[PDB]
Design an enzyme around this catalytic site. Structure first.
Site, PDB file in Angstrom:
ATOM      1  N   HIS A   1      -2.869  -3.917   6.768  1.00 45.47           N
ATOM      2  CA  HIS A   1      -1.931  -5.005   6.604  1.00 45.47           C
ATOM      3  C   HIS A   1      -0.667  -4.483   5.934  1.00 45.47           C
ATOM      4  CE1 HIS A   1      -4.609  -4.786   3.131  1.00 45.47           C
ATOM      5  NE2 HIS A   1      -3.673  -5.350   2.398  1.00 45.47           N
TER       6      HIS A   1
ATOM      7  N   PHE B   1       6.495  -3.769   1.725  1.00 47.46           N
ATOM      8  CA  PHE B   1       5.425  -2.811   1.457  1.00 47.46           C
ATOM      9  C   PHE B   1       4.810  -2.464   2.805  1.00 47.46           C
ATOM     10  CE2 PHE B   1       1.341  -1.268  -0.414  1.00 47.46           C
ATOM     11  CZ  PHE B   1       1.844  -0.463  -1.397  1.00 47.46           C
TER      12      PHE B   1
ATOM     13  N   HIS C   1      -1.157  -0.449   4.977  1.00 47.38           N
ATOM     14  CA  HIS C   1      -2.137   0.241   4.158  1.00 47.38           C
ATOM     15  C   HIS C   1      -3.496  -0.419   4.346  1.00 47.38           C
ATOM     16  CE1 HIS C   1      -0.924  -3.216   1.834  1.00 47.38           C
ATOM     17  NE2 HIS C   1      -2.065  -3.127   1.178  1.00 47.38           N
TER      18      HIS C   1
ATOM     19  N   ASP D   1      -6.663  -1.446   1.658  1.00 50.53           N
ATOM     20  CA  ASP D   1      -6.810  -1.612   0.215  1.00 50.53           C
ATOM     21  C   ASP D   1      -7.828  -0.636  -0.369  1.00 50.53           C
ATOM     22  OD1 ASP D   1      -4.994  -3.733   0.273  1.00 50.53           O
ATOM     23  OD2 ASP D   1      -6.494  -5.274  -0.151  1.00 50.53           O
TER      24      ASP D   1
END
Ligand SMILES: CC(C)[C@@H](NC(=O)[C@H](CS)NC(=O)CCC[C@H](N)C(=O)O)C(=O)O
Ligand SMILES: [Fe+2]
Length: 328
Positions: free
Chosen positions: A267, A208, A211, A213
């Site tokens: 992260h 992933f 980004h 959150d």
């Protein structure tokens, strides 16, 4: 690749009445929020071994029939009302991760936000009790357990910023919170589908991408497999795993209302071929919740940023994250 400084903070004073002790916890939260942005909450009082055991039983015993019946709209055109809550299917040979999302158990057909058809509110969908005995009871119980922990953490964040301890928590209510739990399975697969691995700019193989959150804070329990990295000015750093603690970080709503004093850390998730669990609780407020932004760097706390209703923030943010990082 270096290792991030992620302190372990005993949060138990936040459930007590010793005000000096709460202030010492708050200082540690402030220090971590201004450094890498992550900390482990320890001495939290949640039975995380039963959490992990019951989650594992569900992921491993649910069948393709049941997954279609629970699927969100992106996987099942019949379920137009399920944008957030339900099952997020894996795609064999293409997409490895699968997950189950549920919302506030108080969102029932009788709930006024459901009657009004307000965006981002949905009624949970659940598997058959006879095929998964005790699963819904466990999952609803867990929601309120982590709600309790999160309430206490929000008192710490308020005190860290120089506010009275209910500054955030007053907006985090059982009757209307938009908080969600996601029960994520990352499987072991041999061969691992290459379409499920992304390559970052720096060469790292990812599950992933980078980004921030969409949350006020994120309260995460993960099994004991190292996978997360946090961005710093000097590059990405590994976050060590700890399967007894909860990993905490701020989301972008906190960054907004503090004029980026507490940043939402960027992260990403490394690819690791191992069976593991990732169980985030996204602390969201109510649809109409508004907190006036402030700037703790200024004596008078004045900020020029516009107040942002939590519902509008959440609607835009969830769509944005799908469009940037893909349908999960
Ligand atoms: C954890 N990643 C994640 O949970 C990623 C990035 S934080 N989160 C999301 O996709 C947002 C889920 C929001 C949820 N469906 C809801 O409607 O509230 C991982 O380990 O991938
Ligand atoms: Fe995240």
């Amino acid at each position: 690749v270096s290792k991030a400084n992620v302190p372990k903070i005993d949060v138990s004073p936040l459930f007590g009445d010793d005000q000096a002790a709460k202030m010492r916890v708050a200082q540690q939260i402030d220090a971590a929020s201004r450094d890498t942005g992550f900390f482990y909450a320890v001495n939290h009082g949640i039975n995380v071994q039963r959490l992990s055991q019951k989650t594992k039983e569900f992921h491993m015993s649910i069948t393709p029939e049941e997954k279609w019946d629970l699927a969100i709209r992106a996987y099942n055109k019949e379920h137009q009302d399920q944008v957030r809550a339900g099952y997020y299917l894996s795609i064999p040979g293409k997409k490895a991760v699968e997950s189950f999302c549920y919302l506030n158990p108080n969102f029932t057909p009788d709930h006024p936000r459901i009657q009004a058809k307000t965006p981002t509110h949905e009624v949970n969908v659940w598997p058959d009790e006879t095929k998964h005995p005790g699963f819904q009871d466990f999952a609803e119980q867990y929601y309120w357990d982590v709600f309790g922990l999160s309430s206490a953490l929000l008192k710490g964040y308020a005190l860290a910023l120089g506010k009275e301890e209910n500054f955030f928590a007053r907006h985090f209510k059982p009757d209307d919170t938009l908080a969600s739990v996601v029960l994520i399975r990352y499987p072991y697969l041999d061969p691992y589908p290459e379409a499920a691995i992304k390559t970052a700019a720096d060469g790292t193989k990812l599950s992933f991408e980078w980004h921030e959150d969409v949350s006020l804070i994120t309260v995460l329990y993960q099994s004991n497999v190292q996978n997360l990295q946090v961005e710093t000015a000097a590059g990405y750093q590994d976050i060590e795993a700890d399967d007894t603690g909860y990993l905490i970080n701020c989301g972008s709503y906190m960054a907004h209302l503090t004029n980026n004093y507490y940043k939402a850390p960027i992260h990403r998730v490394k690819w690791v071929n191992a069976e593991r669990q990732s169980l985030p609780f996204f602390v969201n407020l109510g649809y109409d919740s508004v907190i006036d932004p402030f700037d703790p760097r200024e004596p008078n706390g004045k900020s020029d940023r516009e107040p942002l209703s939590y519902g509008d923030y959440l609607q835009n943010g969830l769509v944005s994250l799908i469009n940037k990082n893909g349908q999960t």
